[PDB]
Symmetry: D3
Subunit: 166 residues, 6 copies
């Protein structure tokens, strides 16, 4: 499986780095997409290499999608190409993992009405207004959509996501 | 006029400090309300004294409301008392000024359906999903609601808000 | 009115941003002059665009002058052209607003002998030794010179300065 | 399984957080031991709660040990109780995972002579002088000792360590 | 010889630490005085222990005085007791070393008229207005007063100061 | 005398700056060697200019060597040219001063077996395993090798090193 990550500067560091390594453990290939090639830096100063730009992503080449949190999703969700990648992959039923502010990208994609999941609690009202049945749980599994709230939830978030890719 | 500010740690510094001083220039009394007494610190490190807690606010004692941005609104909007203050003041037609992420508190108050305004562009989709006709302008005036987007808009934001309080 | 600001890196952020927006509210044009074009960054990390260099300033083209504080005045006061701009504008009786360390530029211009005003209290002795009757007040108005001490004084500083430009 | 972590302030954040969550995914209980109760803060600013002090650790109550890196191991290795915990657990054949500077604690425990493993390359010479057959690989498995070098190795480090605990 | 240092938070780190150690090399005793007991922290984050408060200093018990720079002198120079210590020691002809902003304390003491020395160039005009014959040199020796400008001057600053204490 | 420093980014600031100025006081020439020309930055943010790269160093052109601490030695000790400079200078009996983590470079050079000295206590075990008779003292003098532990030892470290160069 080829797993795509849509992120940008000010990503929540462990929310990117944890699934990156957890999915590599399984033998999956992992790719970081952002605005430009080079590096991006997390809220806490970890730097990661960008593999490809949003413009170069062909969603048909990727099997699954991860949406880390932090302040990066509010930047990503204004990029039509990044939102279109998330819209396509999610609506096609490919596995999509989101955490914390990550699902702001899915809100903007317009794909969450009637879906069941969670997010950082600070944006619960925005998830509800997008039509989500919002649950206060460490992980929620709604078909292809695996969602979690905060870094304390990482263990449960990927415990469930790895099952979808098997 | 007695002007109330609803804010918390990680407020956008100039979005609090600018209206605070601008309204004092007019002779209005300005009050900072937050979770606890003591001080709160902005994203950029400016410290301000808290005048009263959300619990101690009686909305009937205040004439107008200011909602600065930053990351503070995502904290404030989870406090039922703070959201109730905003709901009451806004729904009674008292002047309410919001900037950047500030109107996340108004989203949570459930008062924006059918209203027109603006915000930080990163949350435009959340404003639209709350029932706002979102306008990309430095300031929008919709009856009692004066809204702006970013720090570059400060001059226009308070130019319009000062007029409502006269 | 065309209002010139003389500043540099490590300016006290709100002491630049507050008068910048306050004077734009009135419809005045505001210009940031510094060592080079591009941007400058405040003590607290706010970035502002430089409109023109000190070398390109013709003082006859500007109606008023603002001198924010921070650590920037100790840099500005070593630039002969910046000091000459301040000397010319102040000595011609044009409105000049200073706050905090801002009047270090006026000290270096040699224009304060026999004048009355204020500054950041830490440099009161230097103001006295330059020939200033130093007053511990939130704002002092001495003809064309409007002076204040610290960020807490912003409201009173521009309340008085706006009156000189009308 | 009950997994003990020996660490301190200035731990490499992801080297603690990654195995903590990865092992919780398996249903293992995870315990952070340090100098004092309260919190410890990583090099990159993540804070974690300390479960127990080194003085309160009874090594017989834990099944496995994790030694994250950063600057914390040079502090931990001067605490004779922490070193004695590592010596006891490692010499009894319990699973021990180390990464980056983590095995400095094992050097001080005097248990690495004739063993095979890796570390941050900057301390390879110190591992060699302690009697280690040093290997430049993302993960090395030498009986109970699973060792890795840097954060890029996380995926492989816990892939192998999880196998020892099953 | 007993050497006193008058300083406070935001001292220029190397301007305190360098003379501290250089004078200990000679066998002199070194004492840090500040507003309160406990620790003070430099601009660059080095922490030093305060030996005594300004209020507890009896200038007759000390043989020489060092005035480091940074932002600390603008705080120290508003403390009547600290200024009185500097006034007494300097006017009695005891060796006094200053660097960078350090001599702002001597300006406030009122002891520099007709004296010859240097400082951080940003405050040269303030030194001149206090009656100093200001010299742009790495070190100036004017009887008991040894003055330097910036951290690059440290070697020459103490080369000359150690000669006065011999 | 021409004194070479082998260092890199994340050097302990005062451990480089202190001997640099102390040795310049004597009239010695001081040279900073690192990976590349330009500047290097300490743990605490002080920046220093690099005079030459490790590749350009001819050890026969330098009379003495200084090895500051911080995290820089773990980078320097993986550069075989830097290690070969230290090996050559130390084994030829030229004066070598080390402090804190500085002697990690000497460990890697393979020159400490049977020698007597000190270091940061956190790496004492690594010094012992390299064949050092490790002493817990502020300064140790073993022929050409002058060693100290921490920044508190600076005064004694250079007191002894200066004697070797005279
Ligand atoms: O129509 C708006 C909601 O009222 C969104 O554009
Ligand atoms: O008299 C002033 C100078 O004119 C100082 O107080
Ligand atoms: Tb051997
Ligand atoms: Tb041996």
């Amino acid at each position: 499986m080829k797993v795509l990550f849509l992120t940008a500067n000010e990503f929540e560091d462990v929310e990117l780095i944890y699934p990156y390594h957890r999915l590599k453990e399984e033998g999956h290939e992992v790719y970081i997409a952002s605005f430009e090639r080079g590096t991006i830096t997390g809220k806490h100063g970890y730097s990661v290499k960008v593999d490809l730009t949003f413009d170069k992503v062909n969603p048909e080449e990727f099997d699954a999608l991860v949406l880390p949190g932090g302040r990066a999703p509010e930047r990503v969700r204004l990029n039509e190409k990044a939102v279109s990648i998330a819209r396509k992959m999610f609506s096609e039923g490919k596995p999509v993992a989101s955490i914390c502010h990550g699902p702001q990208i899915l809100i903007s994609a317009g794909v969450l009405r009637g879906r069941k999941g969670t997010s950082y609690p600070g944006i619960k009202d925005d998830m509800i207004n997008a039509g989500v049945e919002w649950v206060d749980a460490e992980v929620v599994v709604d078909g292809n959509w695996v969602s979690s709230r905060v870094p304390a939830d990482l263990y449960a978030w990927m415990r469930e996501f790895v099952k979808l890719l098997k």
